[PDB]
Write an enzyme that holds these catalytic residues in place. Structure first.
Site, short mmCIF file in Angstrom:
data_model
loop_
_atom_site.label_atom_id
_atom_site.label_comp_id
_atom_site.label_asym_id
_atom_site.label_seq_id
_atom_site.Cartn_x
_atom_site.Cartn_y
_atom_site.Cartn_z
N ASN A 197 0.68 -1.33 -0.16
CA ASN A 197 -0.03 -0.48 -0.17
C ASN A 197 0.88 1.11 0.02
O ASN A 197 1.92 1.35 0.35
CB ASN A 197 -0.94 -0.22 1.00
N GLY A 198 0.50 2.51 -0.62
CA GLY A 198 -0.97 2.54 -0.98
C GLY A 198 -1.68 3.99 -1.15
O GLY A 198 -2.88 4.26 -1.39
N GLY A 215 -1.65 3.28 -4.53
CA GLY A 215 -3.24 2.17 -4.87
C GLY A 215 -2.94 1.33 -4.04
O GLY A 215 -2.32 0.34 -3.01
N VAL A 222 -0.54 -3.20 -4.42
CA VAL A 222 0.46 -3.78 -5.02
C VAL A 222 0.17 -5.17 -4.73
O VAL A 222 0.37 -5.27 -3.36
CB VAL A 222 1.70 -3.55 -5.00
N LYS A 233 0.19 -4.48 -9.62
CA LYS A 233 -0.48 -3.32 -9.30
C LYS A 233 -1.48 -2.53 -9.86
O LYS A 233 -1.82 -2.59 -11.03
CB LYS A 233 0.93 -2.26 -10.32
N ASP A 268 11.96 8.96 -10.67
CA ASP A 268 12.32 8.77 -9.53
C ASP A 268 13.00 7.50 -9.09
O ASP A 268 12.31 6.28 -8.71
CB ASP A 268 10.82 8.31 -9.10
C1 TSK Z 1 4.44 2.12 -5.97
O1 TSK Z 1 5.00 0.87 -6.97
C2 TSK Z 1 5.98 0.04 -6.80
C3 TSK Z 1 6.37 0.19 -6.29
C4 TSK Z 1 7.88 0.01 -5.65
C5 TSK Z 1 7.72 -1.89 -6.69
C6 TSK Z 1 6.76 -1.85 -7.20
C7 TSK Z 1 6.10 -2.74 -7.76
C8 TSK Z 1 6.40 -4.27 -8.19
C9 TSK Z 1 7.22 -5.51 -7.69
C10 TSK Z 1 7.36 -6.01 -6.34
C11 TSK Z 1 8.75 -6.09 -6.07
N1 TSK Z 1 8.80 -5.86 -4.65
C12 TSK Z 1 9.65 -7.09 -3.95
C13 TSK Z 1 7.61 -5.26 -4.02
C14 TSK Z 1 7.23 -4.96 -2.91
C15 TSK Z 1 6.20 -3.54 -2.48
I1 TSK Z 1 5.60 -2.39 -0.76
C16 TSK Z 1 5.59 -3.40 -3.84
F1 TSK Z 1 4.55 -2.51 -2.97
C17 TSK Z 1 5.58 -4.04 -4.74
C18 TSK Z 1 6.51 -5.02 -5.42
C19 TSK Z 1 8.02 -6.29 -8.17
O2 TSK Z 1 7.95 -7.41 -8.60
N2 TSK Z 1 6.44 -5.76 -9.75
C20 TSK Z 1 6.19 -5.23 -9.38
O3 TSK Z 1 5.75 -4.17 -10.61
C21 TSK Z 1 4.71 -2.73 -8.55
O4 TSK Z 1 4.55 -1.15 -8.27
C22 TSK Z 1 5.28 -1.11 -7.25
#
Ligand code: TSK
Ligand code: TSK
EC number: 2.7.11.26
Lengths: 349, 350
Positions: free
Chosen positions: B30-31, B34, B36, B51, B147
């Protein structure tokens, strides 16, 4: 053991240097700006802080300049300044001997939030009231603090005296002259600052003070995020998307950008229930997109939220009297003198 | 084990809708943005991230539009996308089905730091190198991440593959078309952004990358601070006060302001001793005020600090072969097609 003796000029007196001696030198704060010490004065035995920064010899030190002009119950006092350093460097440091105050709003709030509890509203009123005085005071000189946050609000746990501190970012704003936008800290920056505005006003301090009040009510910062984008999303979740007329009032260069089209969240269910209505109403008048619409520190002190403080029979929780609160000077009231009829009640004249 | 089936357009394939089946669905994040989730695709077992974000009724979602163009081994792949509902609604949601990768540079840097230890040089070279390819690729569509930060650099801890993710801030930059200045987060913001420039270039990502490399070598962030001022102060301690002309190239509005008059600290003294000199040298070419003076991503990949990676007998500490490092595409090389002669070494040609 270990008494240090230096040649210092008093903060407001005449520029005439005296020998000043102090002991119990210990480092209490360190960082970018430099170092902050605690020490005890040998004469009257009083506790003091020593902000030590590097001196730029080119022209004057802005912070020294500002501290010397100020004298106020709710602002830390500059007792002395002096120059130093004798070990291995060859630069000149300025040291400001300031009043010492042991607790901060940042700490108190952290104690409550960590213990899953809320600061009693009486403290919220007390602390926020004194903050608004301190701002009304400094703003009356045209000085803007530019870093209002819980770590710069000092507290006396026993008397409830709040004193504003750290003027290391303060600036006398001149209408028309550019100012850097990159001042002010993580959770507490007005939207005009997030937008990169170089022509903001003192109302950036009122915005910040709103963030502190809202925080003390919530138990956590109201607009968090490690970035501008993230912070702005929080702001919008609460205020709704700024209109074009508001964007241009913050930074005209920003009117054409895509924004999250999110509708205004009702201010009431931002805070949990039984949060005083006057507290919420006050927040909404501080945390306004259009800077010119935010309340002035003086108008805030007069808001119905602080009425309790004006009742003759108010005591602190610990049974003592409330600290000085109605001793307004003319300077303090210059922005709008007819407010004095609310600000100073029947019983203390 | 609850199965879920939706209709979903493949990420970059032909635009033909397809039934996609997933399970093991759980929330991993979160969040503000949105949600994940993690899930497992049914017919291949592969793990994915989903996501989920609020989708603006009014025009196309920028992140989606970007993800659809990208195909790179150091970037997280958009596998599928689909719209759905979520928490109220009204409101429609976009669901991006992405490659899952379990670790982040941010968590790894932290492990070593807690344990008063530095990340082995080899891993730094590998993580930095792959990030430099991801950025060459995206920059060649004129796309800027905006970012870059340790927590957006995913890591397969076992095989050393690094994948860039989180395109929620990414935009395609166009000269003469202004951009918001408040993107990019604490510790990693180029100084043109602290000055609130609206006409910066992709070289902001490279600054941010400089900050990642330095952070990995130092065991903590090079330019910390809870405000722009503090941050700036940290920058200046290191680079010295920016000149009138250096300021003017970052943000010409700022050239007359009062800046703390401090000369640079030697780069040599910024890092612990023992820090390899090629690392210090590389940093020194990334953390430059004048945005155009910084290395392009592709130049950085070609830097001598990466020579070990182009050694034919190089192996990971655990004894495994290095991950894919030399499969450059015409797209990837398009800023300096020559450099290919340094980038793909003798052994990877034949
Ligand atoms: C703001 O969007 C994002 C910020 C950072 C990563 C992500 C994220 C992604 C992953 C994540 C892998 N770990 C280990 C996570 C841990 C988290 I907490 C998470 F949210 C996503 C992931 C992943 O394995 N593939 C992704 O596209 C999708 O939106 C994110
Ligand atoms: C940027 O400089 C400053 C930031 C914030 C406050 C201050 C600060 C002040 C004090 C401190 C009281 N406590 C309890 C502190 C705790 C710390 I840590 C500290 F540094 C100073 C103080 C104080 O009692 N009076 C001060 O002027 C002087 O520089 C500061």
């Amino acid at each position: 053991s270990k008494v240090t003796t230096v040649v210092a000029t008093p903060g407001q007196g005449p520029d005439r240097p005296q020998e000043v001696s102090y002991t119990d030198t210990k480092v209490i704060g360190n960082g970018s700006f430099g170092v902050v010490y605690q020490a005890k004065l040998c004469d009257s035995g009083e506790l003091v802080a020593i902000k030590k920064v590097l001196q730029d010899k080119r022209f004057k030190n802005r912070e020294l300049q500002i501290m010397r002009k100020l004298d106020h119950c709710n602002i830390v006092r500059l007792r002395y300044f002096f120059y130093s350093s004798g070990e291995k460097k060859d630069e000149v440091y300025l040291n400001l001997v300031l009043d010492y105050v042991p607790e901060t709003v940042y700490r108190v709030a952290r104690h409550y939030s960590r213990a899953k509890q809320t600061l009693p509203v009486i403290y919220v009123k007390l602390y926020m009231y004194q903050l608004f005085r301190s701002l009304a005071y400094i703003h009356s000189f045209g000085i803007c603090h530019r870093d209002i946050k819980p770590q710069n609000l000092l507290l006396d746990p026993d008397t409830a005296v709040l004193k504003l501190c750290d003027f290391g970012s303060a600036k006398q704003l001149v209408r028309g002259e550019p100012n850097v936008s990159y001042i002010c800290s993580r959770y507490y920056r007005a939207p005009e600052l997030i937008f990169g505005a170089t022509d903001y006003t003192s109302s950036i301090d009122v915005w910040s003070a709103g963030c502190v009040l809202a925080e003390l009510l919530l138990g956590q910062p109201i607009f968090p995020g490690d970035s501008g984008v993230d912070q702005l999303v929080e702001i919008i979740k609460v205020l709704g998307t700024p209109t074009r007329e508001q964007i241009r009032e913050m930074n005209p260069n920003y009117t054409e950008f895509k924004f999250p089209q999110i509708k205004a969240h009702p201010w009431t269910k931002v805070f949990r229930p039984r949060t005083p209505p006057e507290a919420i109403a006050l927040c909404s008048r501080l945390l306004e997109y259009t800077p010119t619409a935010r309340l002035t520190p003086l108008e805030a002190c007069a808001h119905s939220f602080f009425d309790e403080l004006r009742d003759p029979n108010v005591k602190l929780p610990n049974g003592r009297d409330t600290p000085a609160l109605f001793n307004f000077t003319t300077q303090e009231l210059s922005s709008n003198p007819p407010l004095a009829t609310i600000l100073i009640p029947p019983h203390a004249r």
